[PDB]
Amino acid sequence: MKTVIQDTADVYFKRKSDGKLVFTAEAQTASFSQAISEEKLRGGIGNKPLYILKSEKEINLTVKNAFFDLEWLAMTQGETIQEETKVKVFDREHGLIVDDTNKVTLKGKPVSDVTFYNKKGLTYKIAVSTDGTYTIPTAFAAAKDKLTAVYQIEKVGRRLAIKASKFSERYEVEYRTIAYNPDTEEVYSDIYIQFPNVSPSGEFEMSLENGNALAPEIKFEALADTDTDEMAVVIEASRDE
Amino acid sequence: MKTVIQDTADVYFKRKSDGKLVFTAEAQTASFSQAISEEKLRGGIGNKPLYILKSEKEINLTVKNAFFDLEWLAMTQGETIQEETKVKVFDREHGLIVDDTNKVTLKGKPVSDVTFYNKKGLTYKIAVSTDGTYTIPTAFAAAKDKLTAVYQIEKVGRRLAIKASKFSERYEVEYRTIAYNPDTEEVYSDIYIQFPNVSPSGEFEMSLENGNALAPEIKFEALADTDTDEMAVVIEASRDE
Amino acid sequence: MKTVIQDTADVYFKRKSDGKLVFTAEAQTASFSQAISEEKLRGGIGNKPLYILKSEKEINLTVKNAFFDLEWLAMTQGETIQEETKVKVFDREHGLIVDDTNKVTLKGKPVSDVTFYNKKGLTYKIAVSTDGTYTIPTAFAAAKDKLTAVYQIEKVGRRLAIKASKFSERYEVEYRTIAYNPDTEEVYSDIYIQFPNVSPSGEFEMSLENGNALAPEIKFEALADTDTDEMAVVIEASRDE
Amino acid sequence: MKTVIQDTADVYFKRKSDGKLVFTAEAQTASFSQAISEEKLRGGIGNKPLYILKSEKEINLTVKNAFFDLEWLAMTQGETIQEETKVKVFDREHGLIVDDTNKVTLKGKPVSDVTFYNKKGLTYKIAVSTDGTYTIPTAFAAAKDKLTAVYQIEKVGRRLAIKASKFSERYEVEYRTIAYNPDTEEVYSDIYIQFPNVSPSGEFEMSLENGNALAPEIKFEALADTDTDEMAVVIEASRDE
Amino acid sequence: MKTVIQDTADVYFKRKSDGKLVFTAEAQTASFSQAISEEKLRGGIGNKPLYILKSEKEINLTVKNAFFDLEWLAMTQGETIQEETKVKVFDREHGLIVDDTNKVTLKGKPVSDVTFYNKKGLTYKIAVSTDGTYTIPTAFAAAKDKLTAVYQIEKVGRRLAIKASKFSERYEVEYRTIAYNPDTEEVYSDIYIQFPNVSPSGEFEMSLENGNALAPEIKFEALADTDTDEMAVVIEASRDE
Amino acid sequence: MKTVIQDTADVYFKRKSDGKLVFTAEAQTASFSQAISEEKLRGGIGNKPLYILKSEKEINLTVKNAFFDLEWLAMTQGETIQEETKVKVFDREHGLIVDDTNKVTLKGKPVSDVTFYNKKGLTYKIAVSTDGTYTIPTAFAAAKDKLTAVYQIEKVGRRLAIKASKFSERYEVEYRTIAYNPDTEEVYSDIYIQFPNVSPSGEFEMSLENGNALAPEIKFEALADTDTDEMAVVIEASRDE
Using CA atoms, how far apart are residues F10 and F19, in angstroms rounded to an integer? 19
Residue A56, SS3 per DSSP = coil
What burial letters (b/e) apply to D81-118, b meaning 16+ CB within 10 Å? Answer: eeeeeebebbeeeeebebeeeeebebeeebebebbbbb
Are the CB atoms for F160 and F81 separated by under 8 Å? Answer: yes
Pairing state between β F82-97 and F123-126: unpaired
Helix (H) or strand (E) holding E70: helix E70-77
Closest to A108 measured CA to CA, from A136, A150, A156: A150
Q: Write the DSSP string, C174-222.
A: EEEEEEEETTTTEEEEEEEEEEEEE--B--------TT-----EEEEEB
Closest to D27 measured CA to CA, from D4, D61, D60, D74: D61
Please enumerate residues of A whose Cβ is less than 8 A from a Cβ of C: 1-2, 46, 48
Using alpha carbons, list the distances in angstroms from residue F39 to B194, D192, F33, F46, F50. Answer: 70, 86, 21, 18, 11
How close B154 comes to chain A (CA, Å)? 22
- Angle at CA F143, nearest 5°, toward F138 and F146? 110
Using CA atoms, how far apart are residues F146 and A89, in angstroms rounded to an integer? 58
Please enumerate residues of A whose Cβ is less than 8 A from a Cβ of E: 42-44, 47
Using CA atoms, how far apart are residues D83 and D100, in angstroms rounded to an integer? 46
Using CA atoms, how far apart are residues B5 and B190, in angstroms rounded to an integer? 11
- Cα R_g (chain C), whole angstroms: 30
E-state strands within A55-127: 58-59, 62-65, 82-97, 103-105, 114-117, 124-126
Helix (H) or strand (E) holding A71: helix A70-75
Closest to E223 measured CA to CA, from E74, E60, E62: E60
Using CA atoms, how far apart are residues D52 and D39, in angstroms rounded to an integer? 6
Closest to A97 measured CA to CA, from A106, A108, A84, A88: A106
SS (HEC) of chain F: CCCEECCCCCCEEEECCCCCCCCECCEEEEECCEECCCCCEEECCCCEEEECCCCCCEEECEEEECCCCCHHHHHHHCCCCEEEEEEEEEEEEEEEECCCCCEEECCCCCCCCEEEECCCCCEEEECCCCCCEEECCCCCCCCCCEEEEEEEEEEEEEECCCCCCCCCCCEEEECCCCEECCCCCCEEEEEEEEEEEECCCCCCCCCCCCCCCCCCCECCEECCCCCCCCCCEEEEEECCC
How close A40 comes to chain E (CA, Å)? 14
Residues 6+ apart with CB under 8 A from E80: E74
What burial letters (b/e) apply to F96-124, b meaning 16+ CB within 10 Å? Answer: bebeeebebebeeebeeebebbeeeeeeb
Closest to D9 measured CA to CA, from D179, D172, D171, D170: D179
Using CA atoms, how far apart are residues B179 and B186, in angstroms rounded to an integer? 9
Using CA atoms, how far apart are residues B119 and B124, in angstroms rounded to an integer? 12
Q: Which residue of A has its CA nearest to C165?
A: A46
Using CA atoms, how far apart are residues C183 and C198, in angstroms rounded to an integer? 38
- Neighbours, chain D (3 or more CB pairs < 8 A): C, E, F
Considering only CB atoms, which chain A residues are within 8 Å of B31? 205-208
Pairing state between β F82-97 and F146-159: antiparallel
Residue length of chain D:
241
Considering only CB atoms, which chain E residues are within 8 Å of D16? 184
Residues 6+ apart with CB under 8 A from B46: none
Structure-solving method = cryo-EM
Using alpha carbons, list the distances in angstroms from residue A120 to A141, D114, F60. Answer: 10, 95, 70
How close C41 comes to chain E (CA, Å)? 10
Cβ-defined contact of B41 to F4 (cutoff 8 Å): yes
Helix (H) or strand (E) holding E73: helix E70-77
Using CA atoms, how far apart are residues E240 and D224, in angstroms rounded to an integer? 27
Cβ-defined contact of F6 to B53 (cutoff 8 Å): yes
Using CA atoms, how far apart are residues A22 and A18, in angstroms rounded to an integer? 11
Using CA atoms, how far apart are residues D114 and A54, in angstroms rounded to an integer? 55
What burial letters (b/e) apply to F50-87, b meaning 16+ CB within 10 Å? Answer: eeeeeeeeebebebbbeeeeeebbbbbbbeeeeeeeee
Using alpha carbons, list the distances in angstroms from residue C17 to C169, C197, C233, F26. Answer: 9, 12, 21, 77
Neighbours of A235 (CB within 10 A): 12
Are the CB atoms for B4 and A67 separated by under 8 Å? Answer: yes
Helix (H) or strand (E) holding B74: helix B70-77
E11 CB burial (10 A radius; 0-12, 13-18, 19+): buried
Neighbours of B67 (CB within 10 A): 12
- Angle at CA C59, nearest 5°, toward C52 and A47? 110
What burial letters (b/e) apply to E162-181, b meaning 16+ CB within 10 Å? Answer: eeeeeebbebbbbbbbbbbe
Q: Which of D73, D171, D206 to probe by mutation at the C interface, max C CB count within 10 Å?
A: D206
What is the layout of strands, in order, in the sheet containing B62-65?
Answer: B27-31, B62-65, B217-218
Using alpha carbons, list the distances in angstroms from residue E191 to A156, E1, E3, E176, E196. Answer: 93, 13, 10, 6, 16
Q: After which residues is chain F broken (C to N over 2.5 A)?
A: none
Q: Phi/psi at C70 (nearest 5 deg)? A: -90, -25
What burial letters (b/e) apply to A5-28, b meaning 16+ CB within 10 Å? Answer: eeebbbbbbeeeeeeeebbebebe
Residue D73, SS3 per DSSP = helix
DSSP class of residue E71 equals H
C19 strand-pairing partners: none
D156 CB burial (10 A radius; 0-12, 13-18, 19+): middle
- Cα R_g (chain A), whole angstroms: 30
Using CA atoms, how far apart are residues A117 and A151, in angstroms rounded to an integer? 12
Cβ-defined contact of E184 to D16 (cutoff 8 Å): yes
Pairing state between β F187-198 and F233-238: antiparallel
What is the residue type of F113?
Answer: D
Using CA atoms, how far apart are residues D192 and D30, in angstroms rounded to an integer? 12
Using CA atoms, how far apart are residues A232 and D89, in angstroms rounded to an integer? 65
Q: Phi/psi at B87 (nearest 5 deg)? A: -135, 170
- Cα R_g (chain B), whole angstroms: 30
Are the CB atoms for D72 and C1 separated by under 8 Å? Answer: no
Q: Which residue of D has its CA nearest to E178?
A: D165
Cβ-defined contact of E186 to D17 (cutoff 8 Å): yes
Q: CA neighbours within 13 Å on the CB side: how many for A91?
A: 16
Chains E and C touch (3+ CB pairs under 8 A): yes
Pairing state between β B103-105 and B133-135: antiparallel
DSSP class of residue E67 equals S
Closest to F159 measured CA to CA, from F47, F73, F94: F73
DSSP class of residue D211 equals T
Closest to F153 measured CA to CA, from F100, F218, F106, F211: F106
Are the CB atoms for C70 and C160 separated by under 8 Å? Answer: yes
What is the experimental resolution, given in Å to one decimal place?
3.4
Q: Which of F210, F212, F214 to probe by mutation at the D interface, max D CB count within 10 Å?
A: F210
Please enumerate residues of E whose Cβ is less than 8 A from a Cβ of D: 183-186
What burial letters (b/e) apply to B105-137, b meaning 16+ CB within 10 Å? Answer: ebeeebeeebebbbeeeeeeeeeeeeeeebebe
Q: Which residue of C has its CA nearest to D69?
A: C2
Residue length of chain A:
241
Residue B207 CA, chain-centre distance (Å), reads 11
Using CA atoms, how far apart are residues C45 and E227, in angstroms rounded to an integer? 47
Chains E and A touch (3+ CB pairs under 8 A): yes
Q: Phi/psi at B133 (nearest 5 deg)? A: -90, 140
Q: Write the DSSP string, B110-172.
A: --S-EEEE-SSS-EEEE---SSSEEEPPTTT--SS-EEEEEEEEEEEEEE----SS-----EE
DSSP class of residue E152 equals E
Residue C110 CA, chain-centre distance (Å), reads 32
Using CA atoms, how far apart are residues F151 and F96, in angstroms rounded to an integer? 14
Using alpha carbons, list the distances in angstroms from residue B114 to B93, B110, B111, B119, B152. Answer: 11, 7, 8, 17, 8
Using CA atoms, how far apart are residues A224 and A233, in angstroms rounded to an integer? 11
B87 strand-pairing partners: B155
Q: Phi/psi zone of residue A27: left (φ > 0), alpha (ψ -120 to 50 degrees), beta? A: beta
Are the CB atoms for F26 and F67 separated by under 8 Å? Answer: yes
What is the layout of strands, in order, in the sheet containing D217-218?
Answer: D27-31, D62-65, D217-218
Residue D146, SS3 per DSSP = strand
Residue D94, SS3 per DSSP = strand
Considering only CB atoms, which chain D residues are within 8 Å of F210? 42-44, 47
Considering only CB atoms, which chain C residues are within 8 Å of D223? 49-52
Using alpha carbons, list the distances in angstroms from residue E84 to E154, E160, E162. Answer: 12, 12, 18
CA dihedral D118→D124→D125→D126, nearest 10 degrees, is: -110
Its sign, for the CA torsion F199, F203, F207, F213, is negative
Using CA atoms, how far apart are residues A142 and A140, in angstroms rounded to an integer? 7
- Cα R_g (chain D), whole angstroms: 30
What is the residue type of B224?
Answer: A
Residues 6+ apart with CB under 8 A from D183: none
Q: Which residue of D has its CA nearest to C30?
A: D208
Using CA atoms, how far apart are residues B236 and A157, in angstroms rounded to an integer? 6
D123 CB burial (10 A radius; 0-12, 13-18, 19+): middle
Q: Which residue of A has its CA nearest to B230?
A: A163
Closest to E65 measured CA to CA, from E23, E14, E19: E23
Residues 6+ apart with CB under 8 A from C106: C93, C96, C114, C129, C132, C133, C134, C149, C151
Cβ-defined contact of C121 to A1 (cutoff 8 Å): yes
Helix (H) or strand (E) holding E58: strand E58-65
Its sign, for the CA torsion A9, A10, A16, A17, is positive
Pairing state between β C10-15 and B27-31: unpaired
Using CA atoms, how far apart are residues A53 and A40, in angstroms rounded to an integer? 6
Using alpha carbons, list the distances in angstroms from residue E37 to A231, E55, E58, F98. Answer: 73, 7, 10, 62
What is the residue type of A11?
Answer: V
Neighbours of A118 (CB within 10 A): 16
Cβ-defined contact of D87 to C234 (cutoff 8 Å): no
Closest to F235 measured CA to CA, from F187, F186, F183, F195: F195
E220 CB burial (10 A radius; 0-12, 13-18, 19+): buried
Q: Write the DSSP string, chain C.
A: --BEE-S--EEEEEETTT-----B--EEEEE--EEEEEEEEEETTTTEEEEEEEEEEEEEEEEEESS--HHHHHHHHT---EEEEEEEEEEEEEEEE--TTSEEE--S--SS-EEEE-TT--EEEEPPPSSSEEE--TTT--SS-EEEEEEEEEEEEEE----SS-----EEEEEEEEEEETTTTEEEEEEEEEEEEE--B--------TT-----EEEEEB---TTT-EEEEEEEEETT-
Cβ-defined contact of A164 to B36 (cutoff 8 Å): no
